[PDB]
Ligand binder design. Structure first.
Ligand SMILES: O=C1C[C@@H](c2ccc(O)cc2)Oc2cc(O)cc(O)c21
Ligand SMILES: O=C1C[C@@H](c2ccc(O)cc2)Oc2cc(O)cc(O)c21
Lengths: 389, 389
């Protein structure tokens, strides 16, 4: 074995998050959005957007785009104007910058020198470039020039599951490997004025927020030195049936465009049960303990929108508190595409410590992280919490 | 271990390649390019381009873009016209299609049913979309809906090393995993008319060709059932010193643009020796056999251009036959970005079988695969050949 492998399960050793400082409260967003977009005359479209914000279960979002920046760049306040080069010029800089802040927080918590990072995974849905956001972050952080990089572009909302699926193999197959995992998303790539012709983009305007999350992932944490918070034990990916074109996203000259052509909440909720039952049967095979019930698992679920959570919770018969951590992040940050599930992982561990629960997963031993995105792709990670004190 | 790991080294079990059927001979390309681009009046620019083709060491290339397609879409025959949406509409379809052909050939050689593919890595520098080229290829091939996908967008010329670096961990860390690896590149994303202002893009017009390559990568090949051709033993990635902005590539509204701002051949050749000496010291540590000499290794080197190969060969003192397989692929296909090193791997194994050499690496046991691209990033894979008969 020319490259020695690790022994234990890939583990989350630290989590950091960062958001743009500018906050927009959802109560204010219909007026802010329709004002800066010169569309207050579209009165029926505006009250349809008000209705979507009222139901969004989003209280606030952090956004790079300010009224000042928008007014300085009127092609972003239009609906279908050529804009991509200006959007790129923003996000190729600011997506790695936001990721740097999250990464620096994770490194600080981890406590080891940054040169012990051996691998980097950078995931984003916001902009593309060569060299990529992985290179830029490595430069911003001053990582070793030999760090093994991977940039995951154009992933979308399942990408938080994807980066864990990859990081698990990198950490487990390389003795001593410490994988910096960063998801960073800035809505300047997709923001546009409203129209009555594509109401998909309206839903995105009510839900999408900005943010970055960063993990240190590694196997065999050094006792009394490093601290594990969650363990990755099983991963799965699925293309849901009858979902072709349920979520499309195209990088056009007018920027990134967002399309919903099927009932995404229905497709996810009708199929998720079979996926989870299958995944749990793999992790807990009869030959042996039976799998925990859904209510005895902890839940880190991508909140694509409230209707996905409501229908999943209804179809699976989840007790109402199971999705609390997930909905708290939706409430305070909106849908941050691939970064969102790592914000929920952070929220859950911090609540568990704060409330002196027995484990980092709200007192439960086993848990599920679920990403949903274009495909329709479902990423399933079965996690183990870590006992607290 | 909820997911059992493999034991042996990740191995290449099959290789397939595909190219567009339309061939352009380099002797004809100056006239073809300047004709279809309405630039024959630019007589001094044209003879500077003739000089670059004369020195390119490229005899022919396969190209999706025909004179017919170019004449039907005049924004591609311009130099700086908005074109991205039309380029995308081409390559989001044709890059996975070309990859399908290569994948089907690799699967056929492998000989197992396609549903035994458990993982897919799709690498391209040509277009981006959601769902991505990985999803489209999975659909085109009819792979299992639970295949674990990964799309590597905007990678560039080092990407053939990157996909091996990732595939090695996927194959080795998952018992029974069979990773379909596809690199597919179509120059419709970057083709543009010539100018006297950016001569970088001229070099690209003399060197870049189209093509896809596909591998099956897996650990523990089934004896007498599967056949290993090369083994992945060690990987490394490096950002070369003083190389910031040596190769940039931006996805703009005019399409993908290509920039060279430093002496790329000089940067690579002055630094490659230290990288190889380091990598070989890791694979063959003293504590023990000394590492093979450069002339006793087989060489799969990304041919970014003839000057890179000439200067690497000169600086390392390689015997003139070491880069023969590499230059044969450059000669017959040009620079196909990330796919090129897998074409060379295919050329080398087929020559070794054809000539009844003792191993799949021209009769040598150990070898080096090198990718170079934006960063300036150098990907190093140390390979082991497989003995023949
Ligand atoms: O179109 C977008 C925008 C993007 C996004 C969200 C938040 C952000 O801050 C930046 C970009 O997320 C997505 C996620 C998807 O699965 C599919 C998509 O089409 C998109
Ligand atoms: O700009 C391009 C074009 C691209 C390409 C080559 C062949 C092909 O068929 C399609 C695209 O390769 C590249 C590779 C790089 O490292 C950097 C780059 O900027 C580019």
């Amino acid at each position: 074995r020319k490259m020695e492998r690790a022994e234990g399960p890939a583990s989350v050793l630290a989590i950091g998050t960062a958001v743009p400082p500018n906050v927009v409260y959802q109560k204010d967003y219909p007026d802010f959005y329709f004002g800066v977009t010169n569309s207050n005359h579209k009165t029926e479209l505006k009250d349809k957007f008000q209705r979507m914000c009222d139901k969004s279960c989003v209280s606030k979002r952090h956004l790079y785009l300010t009224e000042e920046i928008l007014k300085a760049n009127p092609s972003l306040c239009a609906y279908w104007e050529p804009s991509l080069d200006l959007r790129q010029d923003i996000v190729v800089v600011e997506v790695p910058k936001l990721g740097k802040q999250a990464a620096s927080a994770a490194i600080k918590e981890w406590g080891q020198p940054k040169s012990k990072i051996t691998h980097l995974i950078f995931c984003t849905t916001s902009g593309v470039d060569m060299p990529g956001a992985d290179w830029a972050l490595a430069k911003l952080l001053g990582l070793r020039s030999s760090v093994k990089r991977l940039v995951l572009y154009m992933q979308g909302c399942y990408g938080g599951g994807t980066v864990l699926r990859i990081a698990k193999d990198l950490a487990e197959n390389n003795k001593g490997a410490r994988v910096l995992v960063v998801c960073s998303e800035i809505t300047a790539i997709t923001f546009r004025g409203p129209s009555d012709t594509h109401l998909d983009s309206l839903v995105g305007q009510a839900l999408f927020g900005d943010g970055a999350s960063a993990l240190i992932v590694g196997s065999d944490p050094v006792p009394a030195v490093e601290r594990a918070w969650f363990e990755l034990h099983w991963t799965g990916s699925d293309i849901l049936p009858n979902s072709d074109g349920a979520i499309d996203g195209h990088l056009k000259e007018v920027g990134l465009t967002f399309h919903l052509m099927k009932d995404v909440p229905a497709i996810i909720s009708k199929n998720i049960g079979g996926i989870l039952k299958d995944a749990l049967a793999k992790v807990f095979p009869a030959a042996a303990p039976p799998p925990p019930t859904y209510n005895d698992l902890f839940w880190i679920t991508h909140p694509g929108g409230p209707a996905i959570l409501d229908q999943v919770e209804d179809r699976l018969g989840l007790r109402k508190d199971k999705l609390a951590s997930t909905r708290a992040v939706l409430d305070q940050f909106g849908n941050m595409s691939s970064a969102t599930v790592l914000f929920i992982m952070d929220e859950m561990r911090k609540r568990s410590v704060e409330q002196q629960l027995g484990t980092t997963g709200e007192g439960h031993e086993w848990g599920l992280l679920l990403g949903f995105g274009p495909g329709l792709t479902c990423e399933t990670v079965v996690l183990r919490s870590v006992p607290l004190v």
